[PDB]
Amino acid sequence: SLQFVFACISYAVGLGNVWRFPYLCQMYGGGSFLVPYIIMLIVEGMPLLYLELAVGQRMRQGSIGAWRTISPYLSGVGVASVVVSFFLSMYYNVINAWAFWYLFHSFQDPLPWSVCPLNGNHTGYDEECEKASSTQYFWYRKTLNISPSLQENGGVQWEPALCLLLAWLVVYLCILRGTESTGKVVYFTASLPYCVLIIYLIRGLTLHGATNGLMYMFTPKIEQLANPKAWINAATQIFFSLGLGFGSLIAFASYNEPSNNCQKHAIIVSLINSFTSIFASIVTFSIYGFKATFNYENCLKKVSLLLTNTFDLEDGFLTASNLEQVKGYLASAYPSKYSEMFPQIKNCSLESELDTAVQGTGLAFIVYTEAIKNMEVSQLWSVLYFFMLLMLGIGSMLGNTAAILTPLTDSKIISSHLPKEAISGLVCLVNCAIGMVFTMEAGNYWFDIFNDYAATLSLLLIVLVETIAVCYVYGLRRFESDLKAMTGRAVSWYWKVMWAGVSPLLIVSLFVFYLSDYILTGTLKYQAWDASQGQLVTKDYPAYALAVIGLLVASSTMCIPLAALGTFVQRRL
Amino acid sequence: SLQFVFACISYAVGLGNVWRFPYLCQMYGGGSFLVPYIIMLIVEGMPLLYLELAVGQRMRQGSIGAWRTISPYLSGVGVASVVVSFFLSMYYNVINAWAFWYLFHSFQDPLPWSVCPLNGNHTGYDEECEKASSTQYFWYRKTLNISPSLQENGGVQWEPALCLLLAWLVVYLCILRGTESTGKVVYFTASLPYCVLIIYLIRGLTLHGATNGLMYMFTPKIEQLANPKAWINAATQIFFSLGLGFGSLIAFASYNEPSNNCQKHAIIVSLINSFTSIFASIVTFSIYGFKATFNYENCLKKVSLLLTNTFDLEDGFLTASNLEQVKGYLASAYPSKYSEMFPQIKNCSLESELDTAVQGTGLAFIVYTEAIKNMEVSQLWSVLYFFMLLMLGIGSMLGNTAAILTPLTDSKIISSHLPKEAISGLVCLVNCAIGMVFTMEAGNYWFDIFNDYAATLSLLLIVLVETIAVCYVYGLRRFESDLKAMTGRAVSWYWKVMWAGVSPLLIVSLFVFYLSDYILTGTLKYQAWDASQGQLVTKDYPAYALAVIGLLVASSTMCIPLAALGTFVQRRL
Amino acid sequence: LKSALGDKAYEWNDNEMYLFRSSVAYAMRQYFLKVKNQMILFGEEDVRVANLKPRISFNFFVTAPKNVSDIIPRTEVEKAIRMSRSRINDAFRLNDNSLEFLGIQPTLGPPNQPPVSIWLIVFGVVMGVIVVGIVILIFTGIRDR
Amino acid sequence: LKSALGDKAYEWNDNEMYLFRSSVAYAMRQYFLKVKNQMILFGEEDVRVANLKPRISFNFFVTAPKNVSDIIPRTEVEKAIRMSRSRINDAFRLNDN
Ligand SMILES: CCCCCCCCCCCCCCCCCC(=O)OC[C@H](COP(=O)(O)O)OC(=O)CCCCCCCCCCCCCCCCC
Ligand SMILES: CCCCCCCCCCCCCCCCCC(=O)OC[C@H](COP(=O)(O)O)OC(=O)CCCCCCCCCCCCCCCCC
Ligand SMILES: CCCCCCCCCCCCCCCCCC(=O)OC[C@H](COP(=O)(O)O)OC(=O)CCCCCCCCCCCCCCCCC
Ligand SMILES: CCCCCCCCCCCCCCCCCC(=O)OC[C@H](COP(=O)(O)O)OC(=O)CCCCCCCCCCCCCCCCC
Ligand SMILES: CCCCCCCCCCCCCCCCCC(=O)OC[C@H](COP(=O)(O)O)OC(=O)CCCCCCCCCCCCCCCCC
Ligand SMILES: CCCCCCCCCCCCCCCCCC(=O)OC[C@H](COP(=O)(O)O)OC(=O)CCCCCCCCCCCCCCCCC
Ligand SMILES: *[C@@H]1O[C@H](CO)[C@@H](O[C@@H]2O[C@H](CO)[C@@H](O)[C@H](O)[C@H]2NC(C)=O)[C@H](O)[C@H]1NC(C)=O
Ligand SMILES: *[C@@H]1O[C@H](CO)[C@@H](O[C@@H]2O[C@H](CO)[C@@H](O)[C@H](O)[C@H]2NC(C)=O)[C@H](O)[C@H]1NC(C)=O
Ligand SMILES: *[C@@H]1O[C@H](CO)[C@@H](O[C@@H]2O[C@H](CO)[C@@H](O)[C@H](O)[C@H]2NC(C)=O)[C@H](O)[C@H]1NC(C)=O
Ligand SMILES: *[C@@H]1O[C@H](CO)[C@@H](O[C@@H]2O[C@H](CO)[C@@H](O)[C@H](O)[C@H]2NC(C)=O)[C@H](O)[C@H]1NC(C)=O
Ligand SMILES: *[C@@H]1O[C@H](CO)[C@@H](O)[C@H](O)[C@H]1NC(C)=O
Ligand SMILES: *[C@@H]1O[C@H](CO)[C@@H](O)[C@H](O)[C@H]1NC(C)=O
Ligand SMILES: *[C@@H]1O[C@H](CO)[C@@H](O)[C@H](O)[C@H]1NC(C)=O
Ligand SMILES: *[C@@H]1O[C@H](CO)[C@@H](O)[C@H](O)[C@H]1NC(C)=O
């Protein structure tokens, strides 16, 4: 009966594990971001999930109902957890939208991203498609057509709008046909991702210069480990990938698990999450090292050609090594021609290029599409990989939607007029109509604005409130005795210390150091595309930027003290 | 519960249906052989099978036991039926041997029959491989190395010997692991042949000039319908393909079928046999018409090239049509050069070529291997088709072996010392050691000697004896009443007349006309390979040829009057 | 031309004959440089052409540069053409069957790569699994009697 | 040569220059026959070559057959080369890059 473990993996695997993790890893050197991940996981990944599953089996009640019965001070954590996932779903659906788009654009020969367009003269390729590669251009222009600045709001684009519409429609269909999609089918949906990842690992590992990718991803470079931004980002990636804080897990083990063990189950799920992350982040980086070394060799060959053309030299004389020697020998040759061309000599090195080659929030897309054009058959692997990604996305999507469809339908006041199908349609409708914003020309700016902050700050506050409450408002020994009574086992001091001792201190120390290094530099610069050059410049935020993040974080996690105040006023009459 | 019909097809499909039928069809014009087949099938194919299945359900006893209980005059028909299949198995196994061989020779690139060898000068291809095609050479030389005459016995060849050994070994394994191979697996083994035949039909139907093959196979040309040889050959092909006379069918419905209907079952099986034959004989002949028209176009282009080279003419001037016109215009041009080359002008026409292009007992091999080299991938379709053929062969093989393993083990005198595994090993051993003869250099001559006659004459005698006995020794009305009593149905006069009225007369009239037209011409000429030219010349039989066919037919069907005599002497003491 | 280039062939005017004479002169230069170690300046007017026909076909022969009575023997011209045939073909887009130098045949086409006649090893492994199944089955049969 | 033919390239001696001059003369003949409708007998000695370098590179220009002071304008040589470029490439096994 292996079905339980495959069901557990189904619970586990999401899209912050396969898509967000590689991007966030690359964003901070990789090797100098990987070790912090393991650290924060070992020290606050496991015990928090243990505690949450334990209290979920204990109370056997809804998210809001559990914290209502626990304490009066704890009325707003449930509604905060609901609105968090509510805000999540909107900007979460556009990823499925893009996967749909790339799938639809793969029924051809050749693939549209595989060849650059032509100029008006029909002589050479479009230089816009040459500064960027054959893929990056297709990503930032064809499917996005982003504006180089944020100040250019612009008009709504309609192809991604339509694709997002279809995504929301298929979401609605999957939710409307029952609150289940597993059972005798879990094997298929749980084995597909691993299988395609193995195939793509075999592919991307027989690619030249792939070793550089792994070498760069693994080496720890101790210069940004002293930056707490990577620390908080890793902590948040773990929190968001494990579904904690959202309340889906505290609600999953409510009408289930009479007296089974939560420690073993949670340990399996957390280990599988970490293994999925660390494995899926190896194929991408092998391929990314391949892309980096190819770009480097191309730069080298181009400058060698310019050199052998300008003065004169037997072809094949400046290949890869003697260049420097030649570079010297041509200095004393005739500097009256050498100095006058020196400002054109391109100066490119491998590690500097490998640092920033494909970076950005669309990393997975640009690297995978670059790897698919290198296959033997193209449409097949394309549609297979994109179907895998879309299926994982829709699975995570329905998982997220459960945690919001359930806690709104149980209240007997709101579900008196309309049944569930009606309110489900209304929420899908408002969700699409608000997420249309990312379809705008400068929509990816809103996307990267939303993602990190709305996934980080509110969740980090709610989890700390949950822990400090369950520990120092209910009593550790009381819950220990309750578990000893319900299951017949004694908790180890291992969790006894880790539930209130270390993690509550470490998380707030990291938060304070994050908010303190925020004032050591000033305001922040996000990104920009610079189509004229084809790289990622670092334009600054506009005025209303800070304001909109302020309202985001406020509306996301300023609800717990409001329930604390409501308790104060409801005790006075 | 569709399993019964697929079991019936399993009972039905053999190798005289897929391999022997196309060869025998081509041997006599095809269209002028197809209609006689339908005639003899409708008039004596169905009712004889009906009668046999009926009496098998009636007696519910062994082959020899049934005819022992029926009448005393009927003791030798069982042993004759046994020795017939015994003689069959030997020369039947070499086909599986050849299929194994061709399978083993298909794990390469390119396929060995696809390219001709070189000469010692390394300038042009071996002319031996050019007179014959790239396949015919591989068939008559590589896997056979036949001698141009029968008088050249020669030494034993060892590669086909070894392959036949492996064939007998796998026969022994399949028989030793139970007396069954079906059950929840019948779908696969019954659907494989049809599926591959559909694929090969789709292939061979998108080949240029394929219409000529079907057109030739279907048109009746009324010049050999007046030859009774085609008549007897078609009758025998039907008899041998339907497993009658061998006793396997009279024994199959013995420990089975308590009171079910035999008419419907036998009708289904006979219709399915005929449909399988007529369908499988369409893909081969489409491909064979393709091969014919290709050979014709090649002849035409070669002579056009010789013409345009010898005098002088703009290239591309003699393509396919104006040739005759040109052929005229070059007569008055300079006959002092035209007459002196006229004896070299090749004179080739489409129908004369299509008459004899691949004819011979290896027809299926030479045409299918020629069709496989024309595929997109080669090893795949090769091994698939040969595995299909080998599986059908081994199925028919175990079916044949059952009808001889059963009736020898029931006698309590012979099965007192040794169990079944021992005697099975002994019979496989003697069968291999006698079938080694076909491995000889001039072994195919022995093969074609055995096939037609041992499959025709003995079977035709045994069936007529069976019919005349069951009708005019037991009484038609008596058996009619017995069936009315056992099953509760009244036989139609349809079978009442056809069991003794028409078929007993027609079969002996055809036999007499066959043996009468044998003396209107004299002795017979069989075939010959003429490696020096690459066609099929018609060498005459040697002296001992007639003697060996005489002993074959005697030993095969001179056992019924011997039992009639044994009854005479066992009534005198 | 019709055979090789199909429905794409160029027409054969006299500029094609000029290019052909130039190709043959180059082929002779190369041979006399790389073998005889001399250096002779053949031109396109030392290749004499005769009997031009429409089915495309003619004779030619090569003389010394200015000594018109001096004719390079046939054997050496054949040698010099074997050496550079693959280049003269490419100059006209022909493939050694649409450009025949009667009396010169190409004979470098030998295919051979069977290491062990690999059919035999597959037969052997199949025979091995056959005999191991047979022995296991006679084992199980005679034992359980 | 090293770029195109890889580890198969021929060396470039003066017979290659002879063949190149012959190819260009043929290309000029064809153009003047199929466009100007004239018929001029250019030879391999009406293609003047200058500044031969080892990185393979030189200048050339074409004159009338025997009137050495008569130079075909640059534009017409470019036209005549566009017309037969795919043939000059094939003569040397080069691919337009
Ligand atoms: C991808 C994103 C979009 C996906 C797709 C979303 C679209 C789904 C949205 C569906 C919205 C409508 C759901 C239809 C449900 C079944 C329709 C049906 O059965 O109708 C029968 C039927 C429809 O009309 P018929 O044509 O006569 O059958 O309605 C009735 O006759 C029942 C009588 C209704 C009584 C009205 C009084 C109710 C309120 C009382 C006073 C309080 C007012 C507050 C109202 C509460 C509203 C919040
Ligand atoms: C996307 C956003 C998601 C939103 C989802 C949130 C859904 C639940 C929001 C409310 C949760 C916060 C709890 C606040 C406490 C309720 C206030 C109150 O009781 O009023 C005092 C109220 C008096 O307050 P006063 O106005 O100050 O006098 O007491 C009453 O007399 C009300 C009578 C109760 C009527 C029974 C109705 C049964 C439905 C209740 C179930 C709803 C809770 C869902 C929990 C599920 C677990 C089973
Ligand atoms: C490489 C992929 C993962 C490899 C592991 C394969 C699967 C391991 C199965 C887990 C074994 C547990 C089986 C069931 C028993 C439950 C365990 C238990 O009772 O715990 C309470 C157990 C009870 O001990 P007590 O203190 O005597 O009560 O707690 C412990 O003392 C064990 C502490 C071990 C800490 C975890 C192991 C690693 C810690 C050291 C630093 C690790 C470096 C990280 C680098 C990793 C690189 C990949
Ligand atoms: C590859 C060739 C295949 C060969 C397979 C043929 C196997 C059977 C061959 C014999 C069939 C011909 C029937 C001839 C009649 C037998 C002669 C006779 O009875 O002797 C008279 C014999 C007297 O003859 P006398 O020598 O003239 O006095 O009567 C006896 O007293 C013999 C005592 C009988 C002993 C019982 C033995 C039980 C085994 C008998 C079963 C064998 C028949 C198989 C049929 C299966 C149906 C159940
Ligand atoms: C591909 C074609 C080839 C396929 C492969 C074919 C090869 C299979 C052939 C197998 C032949 C041998 C079968 C072995 C059967 C099991 C062996 C076994 O269990 O032996 C135990 C055993 C073998 O010797 P062990 O090494 O002491 O075990 O034999 C005995 O000890 C039993 C004592 C035997 C008594 C002998 C007296 C029997 C006859 C009495 C007088 C009448 C004489 C007439 C004889 C009748 C012969 C027709
Ligand atoms: C094309 C593939 C085959 C097409 C046939 C599809 C399947 C047919 C299912 C058979 C129908 C029988 C269903 C069950 C009833 C049993 C029949 C029955 O009762 O028979 C006794 C039935 C009883 O009649 P009674 O004489 O009144 O007792 O006998 C007959 O009278 C029917 C005679 C029909 C003869 C067979 C049909 C063809 C004969 C005419 C010449 C045929 C030309 C051949 C050329 C063919 C070209 C392809
Ligand atoms: C690549 O390296 C060369 C050599 O270091 C750089 O040339 C130097 O450029 C700096 C300006 O940053 C000058 O101050 C130095 O004088 C230059 N070196 C010499 C020897 O003159 C070159 O600038 C680098 N590439 C780029 C794009 O800056
Ligand atoms: C192909 O057809 C031609 C024309 O019919 C044949 O030439 C005739 O051959 C016969 C011999 O069988 C002579 O008697 C005739 O005189 C020939 N015709 C003429 C016009 O002279 C030719 O023989 C045929 N091909 C072959 C191989 O025989
Ligand atoms: C032109 O070539 C011919 C032969 O190819 C040369 O004739 C030879 O001349 C020498 C002396 O001049 C004689 O000894 C030979 O016997 C001649 N050979 C033949 C075959 O007759 C002739 O000399 C050459 N002329 C020039 C100017 O080089
Ligand atoms: C050689 O070519 C030059 C120019 O290519 C010819 O010069 C022309 O001569 C005519 C009269 O002879 C003058 O009217 C033109 O003005 C001249 N052109 C130039 C550009 O000066 C010259 O005639 C040609 N010589 C021959 C013998 O054909
Ligand atoms: C060639 O195309 C370029 C496009 O950048 C254009 O600027 C230029 O004018 C064109 N040249 C001609 C001669 O049309
Ligand atoms: C690189 O330059 C050095 C210096 O002369 C030379 O020895 C070497 O062969 C050159 N390598 C290549 C590949 O040209
Ligand atoms: C060329 O090969 C053939 C083979 O038929 C042979 O008869 C002939 O002598 C060979 N020619 C030479 C010159 O070796
Ligand atoms: C065949 O010959 C006739 C007779 O002149 C001619 O009209 C026709 O074009 C020729 N066809 C071909 C394909 O050469």
DSSP code of residue A342: G
Q: Judge whether B270 and B50 are in contact, CB under 8 Å.
A: no
Which two three-digit tokens encode residue B310?
């010898």
Map residue B43 onto helix, strand or coil. Answer: helix
Is residue C118 less than 8 Å (CB to CB) from chain B?
A: yes
Vertex B293 angle, CA B291 and B298, to 5°: 95
The residue of C12, C15, C83 whose CB has the most chain D CBs within 10 angstroms, and thus the best one to mutate to test that interface, is C15
Instruction: Give, for A414, the enclosing helix (H) or strand (E).
Output: none
Q: Which are the contacts of B228, defined by CB distance < 8 A and separation ≥ 6?
A: B510, B513, B514, B517
> Are there at least 3 beta-carbon pairs closer than 8 Å between B and C?
yes
Distance of alpha carbon A473 from alpha carbon A199, whole angstroms: 51
Which two three-digit tokens encode residue B163?
């392959």
Which residue pairs, CB below 8 angstroms and at least 24 apart, start in A129-136? A131/A533, A131/A534, A131/A535, A132/A534, A133/A295, A133/A370, A134/A370, A134/A373, A135/A366, A135/A369, A135/A370, A135/A373, A136/A358, A136/A366, A136/A534
Q: Which are the contacts of A528, defined by CB distance < 8 A and separation ≥ 6?
A: A148, A149, A536, A537, A538, A539
Cβ atoms < 10 Å from Cβ of A39: 16
Which two three-digit tokens encode residue B360?
């011979």
One-letter amino acid identity for D31?
A: Y
β-pairing verdict for C47-53 and D57-62: unpaired
Q: What are phi and psi of C47, to 5 degrees?
A: -105, 105
Q: Which are the contacts of B30, defined by CB distance < 8 A and separation ≥ 6?
A: B216, B217, B218, B285
Residue matched to tokens 């050591």 = A520
Distance of alpha carbon B413 from alpha carbon B410, whole angstroms: 9
Which two three-digit tokens encode residue B303?
């002579």
Q: What are phi and psi of D59, to 5 degrees?
A: -105, 155
Distance of alpha carbon B560 from alpha carbon B75, whole angstroms: 7
Burial of B493 (0-12, 13-18, 19+ CB in 10 A): exposed
3-state secondary structure B189-245: HHHHHHHHHHHHHHHHHCCCCCHHHHHHHHCCCCCCCCCHHHHHHHHHHHHHHCCCC
Which two three-digit tokens encode residue B109?
């690139």
Distance of alpha carbon A281 from alpha carbon A204, whole angstroms: 12
Could you tell me which of B403, B384, B445, B431 has the C-alpha nearest to residue B165?
A: B431
Is residue A179 less than 8 Å (CB to CB) from chain D?
A: no
Four-point Cα dihedral B69, B74, B77, B78, nearest 10: 20
Q: CB A315 to CB D53 under 8 A?
A: no
Torsional class of B183: left (φ above 0), alpha (ψ -120 to 50), beta (otherwise): left
Which two three-digit tokens encode residue C46?
């030392």
Q: Judge whether B246 and B458 are in contact, CB under 8 Å.
A: no
In A410-533, alpha helices (H): 420-435, 443-472, 476-487, 493-498, 503-517
Vertex A130 angle, CA A126 and A132, to 5°: 125
Task: Taking the CA atoms of A461, A463, A466 and A469 in sequence, report the sign of the dihedral they define.
Answer: negative
In A177-261, alpha helices (H): 186-205, 211-218, 228-241, 248-252
Alpha carbon of B332 to those of A64, B63, B338, D28: distances in Å?
110, 78, 9, 45
In A74-207, alpha helices (H): 76-104, 128-131, 136-137, 159-176, 186-205
* Helix-helix angle B379-409:B186-205, to 10 degrees: 140
3-state secondary structure A360-395: CCCHHHHHHHHHHCCCCCCHHHHHHHHHHHHHHHHH
Question: Would the CB of B322 count as within 6 Å of ligand 14?
Answer: yes
Rounded-to-5 percentages of helix, strand, coil across chain C: 50, 10, 40
Nearest chain C residue (CA) to D39 = C15
Q: Judge whether A164 and A97 are in contact, CB under 8 Å.
A: yes
One-letter amino acid identity for A359?
A: Q
Q: What are phi and psi of A253, to 5 degrees?
A: -90, 50
Is residue A223 less than 8 Å (CB to CB) from chain D?
A: no
The secondary structure of D1-15 as a DSSP string is -HHHHSTTPPP--HH
Which two three-digit tokens encode residue B128?
């031996």
Q: Judge whether D1 and D10 are in contact, CB under 8 Å.
A: yes
Pocket of ligand 10 (CB under 6 A): D 67, 69-70
Minimal CA separation from C38 to chain B, in Å: 32
3-state secondary structure B129-176: HHHCCCCHHHHHHHCCCCCCCCCCCCCECCHHHHHHHHHHHHHHHHHH
Instruction: Give, for B249, the enclosing helix (H) or strand (E).
Output: helix B248-252
Q: Judge whether B296 and B350 are in contact, CB under 8 Å.
A: yes
Distance of alpha carbon A350 from alpha carbon A215, whole angstroms: 13
Minimal CA separation from D55 to chain C, in Å: 22
One-letter amino acid identity for B342?
A: F
Resolution of the entry in angstroms:
3.2
Alpha carbon of C9 to those of B146, B235, D50, D86: distances in Å?
48, 59, 35, 14
Tell how far the Cα of A345 is from the centroid of ligand 7, in angstroms.
9
How would you label A461-477 residue by residue, b for 16+ Cβ within 10 Å and e otherwise?
bbbbbbbebbbeeeebe
The secondary structure of B76-101 as a DSSP string is HHHHHHHHHHHHHHHHHHHHHHHHHH
Q: Which are the contacts of A381, defined by CB distance < 8 A and separation ≥ 6?
A: A372, A375
Could you tell me which of A274, A283, A271 has the C-alpha nearest to residue A197?
A: A283
Question: Would the CB of C70 count as within 6 Å of ligand 9?
Answer: yes
Q: CB C30 to CB D44 under 8 A?
A: no
Residue matched to tokens 């096939």 = B451
Q: CB C105 to CB B123 under 8 A?
A: yes
One-letter amino acid identity for A101?
A: W
Q: CB D54 to CB A308 under 8 A?
A: no
Residue count (chain D): 97
Task: Taking the CA atoms of A499, A500, A502 and A507 in sequence, report the sign of the dihedral they define.
Answer: positive
Within a 13 Å sphere around the CA of B280, how many CA atoms are in the beta-carbon half? 25
Map residue A345 onto helix, strand or coil. Answer: coil
Q: Cis link prior to A110 (omega < 30° from 0)?
A: yes
Which two three-digit tokens encode residue A514?
């994050």
DSSP code of residue B408: H
Q: Judge whether A398 and A171 are in contact, CB under 8 Å.
A: yes
Distance of alpha carbon A356 from alpha carbon A295, whole angstroms: 11
* Residue nearest to ligand 14 atom 11, measured at CA: B317
Q: Cis link prior to B110 (omega < 30° from 0)?
A: yes
Distance of CA B371 to the CA centre of its chain: 20
Distance of alpha carbon B270 from alpha carbon B8, whole angstroms: 10
Distance of alpha carbon A485 from alpha carbon A57, whole angstroms: 13
**Cβ within 8 Å of C, D 27-86:** 29-30, 33, 43-44
Instruction: Give, for D53, the enclosing helix (H) or strand (E).
Output: strand D47-53
